[PDB]
Amino acid sequence: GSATCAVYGDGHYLTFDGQSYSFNGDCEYTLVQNHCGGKDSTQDSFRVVTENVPCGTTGTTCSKAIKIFLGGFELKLSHGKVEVIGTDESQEVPYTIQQMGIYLVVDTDIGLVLLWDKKTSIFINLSPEFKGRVCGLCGNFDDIAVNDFATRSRSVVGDVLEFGNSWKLSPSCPDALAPKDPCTANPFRKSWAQKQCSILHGPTFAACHAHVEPARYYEACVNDACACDSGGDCECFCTAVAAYAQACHEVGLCVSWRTPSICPLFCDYYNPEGQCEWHYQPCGVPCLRTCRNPRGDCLRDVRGLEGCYPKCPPEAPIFDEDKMQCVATCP
Amino acid sequence: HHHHGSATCAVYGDGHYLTFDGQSYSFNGDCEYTLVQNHCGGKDSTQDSFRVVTENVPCGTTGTTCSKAIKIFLGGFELKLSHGKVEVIGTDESQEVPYTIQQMGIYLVVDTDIGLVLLWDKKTSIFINLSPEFKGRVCGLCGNFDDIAVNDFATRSRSVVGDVLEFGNSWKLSPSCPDALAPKDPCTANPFRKSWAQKQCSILHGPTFAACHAHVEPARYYEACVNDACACDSGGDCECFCTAVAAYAQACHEVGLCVSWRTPSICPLFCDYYNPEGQCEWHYQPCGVPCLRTCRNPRGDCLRDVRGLEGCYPKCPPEAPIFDEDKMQCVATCP
Amino acid sequence: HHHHHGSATCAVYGDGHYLTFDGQSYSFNGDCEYTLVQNHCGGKDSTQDSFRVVTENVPCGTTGTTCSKAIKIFLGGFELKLSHGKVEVIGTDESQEVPYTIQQMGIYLVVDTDIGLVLLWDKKTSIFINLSPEFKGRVCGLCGNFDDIAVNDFATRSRSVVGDVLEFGNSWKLSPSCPDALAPKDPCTANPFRKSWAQKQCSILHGPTFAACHAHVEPARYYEACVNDACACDSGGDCECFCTAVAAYAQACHEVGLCVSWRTPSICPLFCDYYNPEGQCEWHYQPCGVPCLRTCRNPRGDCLRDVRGLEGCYPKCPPEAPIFDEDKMQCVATCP
Amino acid sequence: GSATCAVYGDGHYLTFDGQSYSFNGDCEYTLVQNHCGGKDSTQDSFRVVTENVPCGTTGTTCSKAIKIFLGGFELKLSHGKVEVIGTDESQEVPYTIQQMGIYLVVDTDIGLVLLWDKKTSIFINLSPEFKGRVCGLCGNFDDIAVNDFATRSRSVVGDVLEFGNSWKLSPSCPDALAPKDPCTANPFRKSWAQKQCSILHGPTFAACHAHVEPARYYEACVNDACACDSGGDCECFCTAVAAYAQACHEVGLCVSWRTPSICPLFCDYYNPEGQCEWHYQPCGVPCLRTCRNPRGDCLRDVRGLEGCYPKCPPEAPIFDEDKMQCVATCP
Ligand SMILES: [Ca+2]
Ligand SMILES: [Ca+2]
Ligand SMILES: [Ca+2]
Ligand SMILES: [Ca+2]
């Protein structure tokens, strides 16, 4: 059905076709190109652009900002803040911004939806219609995995570094280079990294191990924890584990991996004084009664979510999107 | 506000000590060091042994150690605190238990019957709250408890020594263990972490602790936060920062002022995890619940002695209000 | 706000008995005003805020003795006058926060000041003064100079020691126009017929119930005080005279730490059940005096208990609603 | 209906037929004698005599101990206790002693009821069966007020002193003399006496002022307060006020006046710790089931028994006449 491309952590990319690799560079790159070859007709113009900056001793880079071109609308994402720098006289809002759980989801009627975590991880979900007519970091969107290493031109080069360098926004940004092992660079952190990422091999994800392999995710976790010594290693570990959790939720499984000791949430903070209406749902609550989407409306899309959700009481059951409360009716 | 007649020794982070009389200093050394002793030798004025010892261990590549295991020997009993669990190594023939273990909030409250109550968070920090009864009878790393700060460096030799390192090594336990040295500058050792350290520790200068800024200074605590963040380069810097800020938070709450600082962005708490399915009995309390009806406290009795028991507590409904001291639930009654 | 645990006690009760902070005791009387406690000691200003207390003493019988009728407090421009169990506020500027916190406690109208001084009033010629140690060696007046020595008292307003109690009182009197005082005849000699009744009433001091305090506080001086105050007081209400005389010794015993339950339905009774809500029994006599309560002014967790020994009727809140609603006379579960 | 005499304070009297006066003298006086002529009259003889010992330096006598004789049964009463001396194993003990309220009450099957407050005050209740048959200081019960002051040998004189001296018992006791003014003797106490006894004119007795005049009771209060100079004027003041309250409650009016300011009680003292079963009942408790008092015995004994009362909780509702507790059932 709908495809999925994942970008997270220290240059970890998952193509639409399932291919994975690593690539880091202090430059802007296009995760997906709509008008591959400038086919402006019979299609809606859109783009997804990521901004990377080095975030460690080894020089590896991580995503910091997300800029999306969308039919004459340009949106800027940075530290959980959505910004608009592009609009059109049509006055219609093609995109909808929602805060479902920890994720900040933007959906457009054209069939595209981005599951952008507020910190550093971005997920792309595309309708099957755009199969075979998009290209870029996320792949060419067909059933064949090998051909996805195609440059900005139609030429196919097997070098991961060459493929990454080809899709740079401007020649001004420097060419990327193959990174050394952060674990080798900082062997002292290796033991702590292994102990932290051992949860991926723990009993918590044993159920998901059947449908999704943890090996690549395990080495990604340990490498990221070895790196990002400049601060917030807990953030790196949390992002890696959250990426694995979202991958598990892709197939439909649901695991409550979060504990008060590791990567905990603060659902009680959003809770109103005295009144309790918030809980953490590992699977996510689909089709909750909001102002825009009351119980009359519903959508089984964006499968796979987690975080704090408002347990609306039966009285005043419709959630207030802009007031963060449960109300009987909405404006 | 201004207070007199109570004291509490504070040890947290990497060698950050706060004596009973208010002295603050840094220290290091992979050894065991006595914390407090009342007998001050063979002289026992109808008291108990009352000896608290702490074992250190280097954490990080900068040669800076942090507290990992804490043993409290009292009346022959030996209780070891490590890996977040209370362990008892020796039980005396006196069937009367001289200590009570309660998980009040995040802290692992250890309260004794002789007016001594401990405060362990299972993570490289400890607060030794002491009754004013033992005033002037305290020999150890937490000062003389004579309400004088300068003489707290009398060392085990009982001669005042200017060097904090000499003081600590005099109070050291194992002769075979190596002597301490001057700690290296952490931020100088790891320059790249300085910006992140400042960004994290800026919370102390932020508006959240505006009320505490008037009463308790944040400068030393901010310096400790920056130092620990710079030094914690062997993983788990988030825990270092959380403990550093929590020390100042508890110090502010000790004077009586209530301050809420935890946010989902910084040092979050996940007490909804303990919440039974569809109950929401637990909630967040900055000052903590002063007292509640537990299995071990079925009466509405309230000690109300220690201050600022941070964490999340269960707001039991009026039906079945007495809490379960063992099964973590709001039950109708206890055995 | 926060007050230190250390304290010193000065007491005055009945027909003009006094108890200095140092421990010195002396009998005195006079129809004048007297600065019991002086902060600046004659205009010598310091960093600490200036405060001063004074009492109005009127004749209280036909033997010439005087008992403290009205208590006047001066601190930071604020003037508090106490009379007939009420509190008169005269000096008050709203540009500054009120420094005192009046709060009824047992049979005492506890008025607390943020400086470090708390005052206890019995509404019947009885005053208890508690002072923070930070004022040691700085205060002066009838309550003493607050040092370890006791015989070095009788420090006149002229910063001189005269030794004679009468001359000390005359020099530390306030009103210049008011006449000189003098030790009068023995009231028991004046009214010998009441001597037997006085002995019968005050025998409780030598009674078995005070044997525990006998080893800590010598009742002999208190016995003489009780006998003398039972004598005179001929203008009516001798029961109040005897009750406050006994209560002085009881409070002195409570200051040591010992607890005595001396009140019986026959001698100095208290009508605790009067304050009890209809069909409910929460008020109960507490000889010790409960150190702290759960109120709106004092929240559930707050238990500031610097002062001890406040005997009186006290509401024992039910466990379901342990928080007491002061000024509402009920126990609840929350405060606004 | 049933007659009622009363004696209280310094020789203040109120006959059954409403005559009110004052008297004094340190001598035994026959309050009530069942035989006017002293003959058998085909009826057992009951005789009640008190001793008005001097009370106060001013020279006014007041009752201290009260002696009661009937059929060889003597119950010396003093110091708040019953001291039975005279008794007869024949027939059956014709008296039961109870302590309802503050009052100590002894009742006889013949219809004569005595109320004692243990402090210089006595109240008599007599059935109408004895009307026109009794003689004593309390006056002959014949519904006539003028025919009172009946001296011995059935003679009437206008001198209260001579009437009392005729009814005197001790041959050698001194003759009574006209009382002086205690307030004139002690003008200093007069201000306090007036201020304290002004409670009678206060609003708390407004509901009873119309039914019974307070002027005589106020005069008695002020005179006794002036007279009381040996220590304990509170006692005589409380006795006067309680006498007026009992006179009011005899009519049926229900008045509550006890407050910690004036004449306080100590009901809590009887209450055991954690057992607040005792309470103050100014109006009296008509129905009780204390031990000998049968369970569910909601009948009437006397009206106006003001005092602390042990309100029994519903469980174990039988109060203990000797233990001061609520038991299930006394033997
Ligand atoms: Ca492909
Ligand atoms: Ca010291
Ligand atoms: Ca002195
Ligand atoms: Ca008649």
Residue numbers in the entry:
A (entry chain A), D (entry chain C): 899 to 1229
B (entry chain B): 895 to 1229
C (entry chain D): 894 to 1229
What does the paper behind this entry write?
The two gel-forming mucins MUC5AC and MUC5B constitute the main structural components of the mucus protecting the underlying epithelia in the respiratory system. The VWD assemblies are formed by the VWD domain, C8, trypsin inhibitor like (TIL) and E domains, except the VWD’ domain that only has the TIL and E domains. We determined the cryoEM structures of the wild type D3 assembly of the human MUC5AC mucin and the structural single nucleotide polymorphisms (SNP) variants Arg996Gln and Arg1201Trp that affect intermolecular interactions.
Similarly, the structure of the tetrameric 6xHis-MUC5AC-D3 Arg996Gln assembly was solved at low resolution (6–7 Å), not enough to reveal the molecular mechanism of the non-covalent oligomerization. Intermolecular salt bridges and hydrogen bonds are formed between lateral chains of Asp1199-chainB (Asp1199B) and Arg1198-chainD (Arg1198D), and between Arg1198B lateral chain and the main chain of Arg1193D and Asp1195D, Arg1193D and Cys1185B, and between Arg1198D and Leu1197B and Arg1198B. The comparison between the tetrameric MUC5AC-D3 Arg996Gln assembly and the free closed conformation dimer shows significant differences only in the TIL3 domain region. While the tetramer chain D shows only minor deviations, the TIL3 loop β1-β2 in chain B changes its relative position with C8-3 and VWD3 domains allowing the interaction with chain D. No interactions between the His-tag of one monomer and the core of the other one were observed, just His-tag–His-tag interactions, supporting that it is an unspecific interaction that stabilizes the TIL3-TIL3 interface.
